[PDB]
Amino acid sequence: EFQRKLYKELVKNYNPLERPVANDSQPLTVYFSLSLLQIMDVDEKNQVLTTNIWLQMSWTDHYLQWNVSEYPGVKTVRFPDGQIWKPDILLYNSADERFDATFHTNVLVNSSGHCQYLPPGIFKSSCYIDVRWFPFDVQHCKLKFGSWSYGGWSLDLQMQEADISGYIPNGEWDLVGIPGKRSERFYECCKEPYPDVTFTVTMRRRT
Amino acid sequence: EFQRKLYKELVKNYNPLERPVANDSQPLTVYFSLSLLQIMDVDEKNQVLTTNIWLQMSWTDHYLQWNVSEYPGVKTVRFPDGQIWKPDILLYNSADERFDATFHTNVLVNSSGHCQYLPPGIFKSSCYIDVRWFPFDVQHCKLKFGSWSYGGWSLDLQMQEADISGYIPNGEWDLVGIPGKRSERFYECCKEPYPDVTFTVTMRRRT
Amino acid sequence: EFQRKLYKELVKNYNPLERPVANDSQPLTVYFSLSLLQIMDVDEKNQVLTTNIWLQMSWTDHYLQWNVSEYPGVKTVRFPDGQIWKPDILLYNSADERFDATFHTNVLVNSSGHCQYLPPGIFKSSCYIDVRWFPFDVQHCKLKFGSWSYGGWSLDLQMQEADISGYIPNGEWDLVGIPGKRSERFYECCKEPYPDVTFTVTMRRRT
Amino acid sequence: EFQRKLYKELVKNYNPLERPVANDSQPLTVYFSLSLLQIMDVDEKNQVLTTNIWLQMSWTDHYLQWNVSEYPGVKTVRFPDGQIWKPDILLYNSADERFDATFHTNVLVNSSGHCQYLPPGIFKSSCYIDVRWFPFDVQHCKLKFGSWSYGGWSLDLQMQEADISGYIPNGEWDLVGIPGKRSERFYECCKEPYPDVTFTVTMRRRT
Amino acid sequence: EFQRKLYKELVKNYNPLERPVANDSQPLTVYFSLSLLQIMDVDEKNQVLTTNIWLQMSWTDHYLQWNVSEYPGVKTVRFPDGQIWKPDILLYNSADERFDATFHTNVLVNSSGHCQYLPPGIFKSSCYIDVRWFPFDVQHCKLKFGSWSYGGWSLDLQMQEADISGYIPNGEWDLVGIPGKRSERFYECCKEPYPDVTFTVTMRRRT
Amino acid sequence: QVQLVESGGGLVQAGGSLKLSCAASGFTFAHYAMVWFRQAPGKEREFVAGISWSGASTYYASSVKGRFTISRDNAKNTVYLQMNSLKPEDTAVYYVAAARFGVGVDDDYSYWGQGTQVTV
Amino acid sequence: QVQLVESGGGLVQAGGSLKLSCAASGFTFAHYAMVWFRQAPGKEREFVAGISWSGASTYYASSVKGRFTISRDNAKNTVYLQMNSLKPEDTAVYYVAAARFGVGVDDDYSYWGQGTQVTV
Amino acid sequence: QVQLVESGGGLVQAGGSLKLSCAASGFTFAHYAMVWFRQAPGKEREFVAGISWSGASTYYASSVKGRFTISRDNAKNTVYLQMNSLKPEDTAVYYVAAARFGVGVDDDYSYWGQGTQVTV
Amino acid sequence: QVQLVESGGGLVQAGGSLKLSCAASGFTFAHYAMVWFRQAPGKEREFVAGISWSGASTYYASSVKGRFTISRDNAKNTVYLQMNSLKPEDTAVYYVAAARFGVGVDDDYSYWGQGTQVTV
Amino acid sequence: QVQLVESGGGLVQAGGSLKLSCAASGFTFAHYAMVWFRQAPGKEREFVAGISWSGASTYYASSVKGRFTISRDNAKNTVYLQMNSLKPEDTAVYYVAAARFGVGVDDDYSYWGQGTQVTV
Ligand SMILES: *[C@@H]1O[C@H](CO)[C@@H](O[C@@H]2O[C@H](CO)[C@@H](O)[C@H](O)[C@H]2NC(C)=O)[C@H](O)[C@H]1NC(C)=O
Ligand SMILES: *[C@@H]1O[C@H](CO)[C@@H](O[C@@H]2O[C@H](CO)[C@@H](O)[C@H](O)[C@H]2NC(C)=O)[C@H](O)[C@H]1NC(C)=O
Ligand SMILES: *[C@@H]1O[C@H](CO)[C@@H](O[C@@H]2O[C@H](CO)[C@@H](O)[C@H](O)[C@H]2NC(C)=O)[C@H](O)[C@H]1NC(C)=O
Ligand SMILES: *[C@@H]1O[C@H](CO)[C@@H](O[C@@H]2O[C@H](CO)[C@@H](O)[C@H](O)[C@H]2NC(C)=O)[C@H](O)[C@H]1NC(C)=O
Ligand SMILES: *[C@@H]1O[C@H](CO)[C@@H](O[C@@H]2O[C@H](CO)[C@@H](O)[C@H](O)[C@H]2NC(C)=O)[C@H](O)[C@H]1NC(C)=O
Ligand SMILES: *[C@@H]1O[C@H](CO)[C@@H](O)[C@H](O)[C@H]1NC(C)=O
Ligand SMILES: *[C@@H]1O[C@H](CO)[C@@H](O)[C@H](O)[C@H]1NC(C)=O
Ligand SMILES: *[C@@H]1O[C@H](CO)[C@@H](O)[C@H](O)[C@H]1NC(C)=O
Ligand SMILES: *[C@@H]1O[C@H](CO)[C@@H](O)[C@H](O)[C@H]1NC(C)=O
Ligand SMILES: *[C@@H]1O[C@H](CO)[C@@H](O)[C@H](O)[C@H]1NC(C)=O
Ligand SMILES: *[C@@H]1O[C@H](CO)[C@@H](O)[C@H](O)[C@H]1NC(C)=O
Ligand SMILES: *[C@@H]1O[C@H](CO)[C@@H](O)[C@H](O)[C@H]1NC(C)=O
Ligand SMILES: *[C@@H]1O[C@H](CO)[C@@H](O)[C@H](O)[C@H]1NC(C)=O
Ligand SMILES: *[C@@H]1O[C@H](CO)[C@@H](O)[C@H](O)[C@H]1NC(C)=O
Ligand SMILES: *[C@@H]1O[C@H](CO)[C@@H](O)[C@H](O)[C@H]1NC(C)=O
């Protein structure tokens, strides 16, 4: 059938190791945004923050385009981990023993090649805990995400506002907010930018 | 022998990535129902519910049909994980560090192509704990299951009543019940339904 | 050499997914027996029993027969997990987060095709704990084993008496015994038996 | 180059499942010795001993020989787990949930085919704890190692004295010693020996 | 495209098991340096140090060179674990149950074949804890890194100063420093050096 | 008793018409995509026509599209190749292959027929 | 000393009968599915007949079904091909292949015979 | 209805010029690298020319570089092979292969054309 | 400098005897199973004889067993094929293949010889 | 623009000498092992000579060792085959293959040349 034909054809000449760009001299734009579900633990002895987060990475695979007319009924396609290229966006300041709490789900691609990736995870992040206004302390825990091996001009990481629509309130900490900021950091050797997205969760101790 | 012939033939042209539907423009009906075995833990600080659950997903693989007369003695077949298509039904509000507590068992297919999947698991789910009627509190913990990447018109998720015939009573919580409800949620971009099944376990604190 | 020839030949036409029976209309007899090594933990809040158990499953692979004269010096052969068919015997009432505490060792096959499988494991099983004769209570913890997807007429599960020759006494519980019983359970749709083996460990609280 | 040629040639006709012996009717000699690094935990409620141990298994692969003159500069070769045959030496009385705490490192083979295997591990072993001379008790914890599926006449397990040169003293237990003993155990059916090596760590409680 | 061509060509004749040296009789120089992020735990009963460390290993793959002019826009390439040769640099005195806390990230190679490897990890290392100046004790915890199977003349391990620019201060221990030292150890059988790099973290108890 | 029997071959002049018919037995005809291959005497086999298992997709070789028409009848377990305006290079043994639930172009075939010789 | 010796070939006229017999030695005959392949002089090998290791399944090529009959005798370690009404295209060297516990159609063969020439 | 129709073949003398043109249909032409293969009568197929899917990379066989020029026109879905100074060994059926987003030299082709005979 | 030099070929009458000898160099002869293949002029290569690396297992083709005898001498690094009662179909170029620690029948060969022509 | 141009072929008498030379372009010559293959008219390709990418390992076929000498010059990107005492079976088209960092005997080749005909 048409889905079988499309699945056979889409992997004809496909290397998961290669960035899915038409031109190799321009970056692939990857839109990143997290969804906070609940703050599970705020460890104060070991400066670690444990949260439930659904990542959302959207990019464009130039190699996963097809004609809906030529493939009637098949307007979307799913690819497991390791069969297509995915951004190596990781939490830099992660204190998890495996360092990658994401559950690798399938990547969803539609007819234009737009790939959506929604990894859920229980993220343990390094957060300096300041306890000197103990009964009324406000803490800014930074969740710093970026490509491990790609820099600018190859993987252009763009930011989208995090949504707290599915947030579950905590019995000890009140979520003042979670604003995100995109920053660019530079080596001395090259003028190559290195983008990153930091979501700074602001919490207040509940009294 | 006939079982060897059938196993060789069933995977002649088979892509596990493809939805096993005869027509790609109509959904595959997947019947979902859980079996509660015991409520192991109700964590109140971290709003997490730990339960023993046997999932049951039944669908129809159009590609796994055969003639019992042509294959005498072989009226059933088993396929491990990763060799045939399986629904991506996951617990959305799961607080497990791996996010998928299911143990991937073999899928059982009979002569008409009907596939049965029974994953056991120790599910850690996010449940808001209300403690204000503490000595006589009744809590409604929701177990929300759905396809991670398939929506309506592709994977029609239908509900079957959960059975508590194998339930093991808990020493702290009394199982008032576990009714299930099928809901449909809609995006703004499309009229595409997204089904889900929520089993709301109702528990009473034992005094 | 002869071992190399035998290993190359034994996997000529072999499907691990297929039941190793000469005739597909009669069951394969699998002999099951456990060996208790020590009772590690008896959890009373979470009704879970933790024990060290060496399973022993013996069956006959019709496809792994060879001539000792034609293969001098090679009277036995080892196959890792996933290369030959193994019974899907699991602990039904297991409370382990992975649900399968067995360590998949190699299967040993001799010249007649007799396969021996000895998985060690630290089994966490669901056991209702009755505490009303607390200082002198005797508890019957059931370890229920069976094929996950095979029933009768396909996988005839037979029982052998468990041995406690390697048992290590516990400092809190005295092993009164561990008798096994083979039971058959029936669906309403078919007259197909479903065998299972329940080993009921009987323990007394040590005073 | 010569290393590339040697790596390509060494796996020409190689089955990891086959014992690397020139003659199949005589055993392969495997020399076993452990290195104690530190005693991490002595659990008294659950009769379990936790230690840091580096195993050392040395054997001879008849199939991994080459000419140093024909391969200049290449006098050694490394093979990962699963690509060449390794002895199935396991700790019989292990109380670890995975039952195999060894980290599978690469096997080192030199020009004569001599294979060295050094798996590090944090071994949890079953040890009966006798507490009746509590302030001055000396305990003999046995670490019993043997081939899981090979017996005598196939895998001749020989013992080498354990070294405590890298031992880290414990703050609660004093290492009186760790002598090893090679024992042979016999079935009733056959006269086939089954060798094993037991290292009996002798510890004294520190007062 | 050019990236696709380069990825196809780079693995034409490539064995990950082979040391990427032009001449097999001279060593490959591997530069090693760690980055301390935070000291998470100093266990005193079990003499174990838990730290967050980003390793950095740099070497030269002679087989991963290409012409930037012949491959416009492709000046860098990423290879996952298991597809190209990587140094087997491990923490010798590691007390982790898996013995390897590194998260295997992609290796980055540029046009000259220079390979960079940055494994993050939560390292549990064996450190003798001296408690006799308890309120004012300074402790020297050694992190000993080396090639598990390669020695000198094959893998020349060189040291680079560790950086503490990303260090997160601990609430109980003050990082006096972390100097590194490269040592060479010799067997009696051969004059073959065995290099290792020991980073001795110096910490003071905070009062 | 899986069998694919082809019939309708023979001698034709150029610009003629021939209706090749292949009958299938021993297997579920509706579950298999049915394709036509040809073998010219001293050359290799090549795809001519193919119909999907559902019959909703027909694929023809570029050398033959417009002239040949593949069809299937599941009631009679038959595959038809209606050839119009044959040409001298349309001279070969035509035989039918069956692929389990195949798309109709690139598939792993399970059953092969004997074949009928047609000459132009 | 695995050996498959074929016999019974020779010259026959059209519409004749020939009983080809292959004797096996050096291996367990009852554990192997035994099939007949043919090699025409300037063509490729092709399947003619096949019997399962248990002898309960016989598979014939569409070009030969009804005319050829494969059988096996485990007591004498023999495979028989009884051919009736031979035809000019039934002219080839016929040789026997053995597959370990094979089904009889699609199998990985381990032992091959020499072959006997039959001409029609 | 994937189709690759070649045209422009025929008889030429040595040191001549021929413009072969292949029209594509049924698939996204701009998404496929388009290459030219040749089949001499009693030899095997061999690569002659190839253009990448983006059209920014052209690869020619060593036997033909400088004389043949591959080009593509995505507006008309056409692949052109401009041959100058043909030579007696440039006598074969030339046919076009398409590879999904191929580089242009080593690719897994999906669609094949019929071919045009050129003789020198 | 791996080399396998065959010698002893030539012209023989039917029912004769020939001792083919192959000398090996450049590799450990005792570590390799040494087999004899033949190439008839217009057919494919086929196995004739084979000896294991240890020399304790000899495997002959069914067409040649009883007449041909393979042997090896590790001291001289030589493989011998003693052929008795040759027959017209024993006319081919005989060449020797070496497989690392091979069993002697089904192995992945590493080194190939040139070959000597024998005619009956 | 990867190109391997062979030259130096032609007609020679038996017991002669010929220096075949292949020039490489479009790729790093020092990174590739360069080998010589031959194609006799009605036979298959076979290895003749090979030099490693570093030039420190030369491998010759048993039929040609002692007579042929492979060499490489990285400054001129050239591979030389010096043939002495040619023989009638040394009549074929000789063409050069390149393998990325290949050993020189068993490698996956990336680039192939056109070839020069030599006749003895
Ligand atoms: C496939 O998905 C893409 C992305 O969702 C749709 O294209 C537009 O993409 C931009 C961002 O890349 C969005 O802001 C637009 O809202 C998208 N347009 C929509 C949703 O109409 C595209 O439409 C989707 N469908 C097809 C057939 O390509
Ligand atoms: C194979 O399994 C199916 C499903 O269990 C059986 O078909 C019916 O399926 C519906 C739901 O899809 C059930 O409600 C019916 O009870 C099933 N009929 C039965 C159980 O008789 C089917 O009968 C089974 N057997 C075969 C040979 O197809
Ligand atoms: C191979 O193993 C089998 C099973 O252990 C042996 O056959 C008999 O099997 C039955 C149960 O299936 C046992 O009760 C008998 O004790 C076994 N006979 C023995 C151990 O002599 C068989 O003998 C073993 N050896 C061979 C060569 O087949
Ligand atoms: C390769 O390793 C082996 C084993 O280490 C060396 O051979 C001897 O092996 C015995 C035990 O099998 C040791 O007791 C000897 O000390 C070893 N001889 C030595 C170390 O000289 C062998 O020498 C090593 N080298 C080669 C080229 O084979
Ligand atoms: C590729 O990376 C290497 C290594 O970073 C660069 O080569 C030099 O390598 C040495 C150490 O091996 C460094 O100390 C130098 O700073 C590097 N030179 C630089 C960074 O200019 C090389 O330049 C990089 N780029 C290319 C095209 O090879
Ligand atoms: C790719 O981008 C470069 C620079 O932006 C440009 O010069 C080139 O024409 C583009 N297209 C290619 C290389 O096909
Ligand atoms: C393929 O897509 C193009 C435009 O996207 C459209 O014109 C064409 O009709 C489609 N193919 C078919 C077979 O309809
Ligand atoms: C599939 O479904 C569509 C819409 O329901 C229908 O038009 C079509 O005929 C069906 N069958 C096919 C595409 O073979
Ligand atoms: C296959 O099934 C059909 C109907 O399901 C039946 O009529 C036929 O007899 C079966 N095949 C055989 C060989 O019996
Ligand atoms: C298999 O068993 C069935 C029923 O017991 C019997 O009829 C048949 O003859 C047996 N043998 C076969 C199918 O080869
Ligand atoms: C194979 O086994 C049979 C009986 O089991 C025996 O008679 C025969 O001798 C054996 N084969 C050989 C070569 O000895
Ligand atoms: C192997 O050992 C057996 C018994 O020790 C002996 O009879 C035989 O000759 C040895 N060599 C072989 C089988 O090649
Ligand atoms: C191979 O080893 C043997 C002895 O081990 C030696 O005589 C010979 O010279 C070596 N090969 C080469 C090419 O040097
Ligand atoms: C490799 O190094 C050795 C020793 O330094 C030298 O003799 C040799 O020429 C070098 N090159 C090779 C082996 O190609
Ligand atoms: C390849 O690199 C060399 C030097 O590194 C350069 O001269 C040459 O121009 C490059 N190739 C191309 C096609 O530019």
Numbering used by the authors:
A (entry chain E), B (entry chain D), C (entry chain C), D (entry chain B), E (entry chain A): 1 to 207
F (entry chain I), G (entry chain H), H (entry chain J), I (entry chain G), J (entry chain F): 2 to 121
Provide excerpts from the study.
E3 and C4 bind to a common epitope involving two subunits at the apex of the receptor.
We solved the cryo-EM structure of the α7∆ICDcryo in the presence of a 50-fold excess of C4 (1 µM α7 pentamer for 50 µM C4, C4-Apo structure). After 2D and 3D classifications, the final set of particles yielded a 5-fold symmetrical reconstruction, with five bound nanobodies per α7 pentamer. For the ECD and nanobodies, the density map is of good quality and allows to confidently build the main and side chains of the protein with a nominal resolution of 2.3 Å. In contrast, the density of the TMD and associated lipid nanodisc, although visible at low contouring of the map, shows poor quality with no elongated and rod-like feature that could be attributed to transmembrane helices. Those markers indicate that the C4-Apo structure shows an apo-like conformation of α7 ECD. C4 adopts a classical immunoglobulin-like fold, despite lacking the canonical intra-sandwich disulfide bond. Therefore, C4 appears to be a neutral binder, preserving the nicotine-elicited reorganizations of the ECD in Cryo-EM conditions.
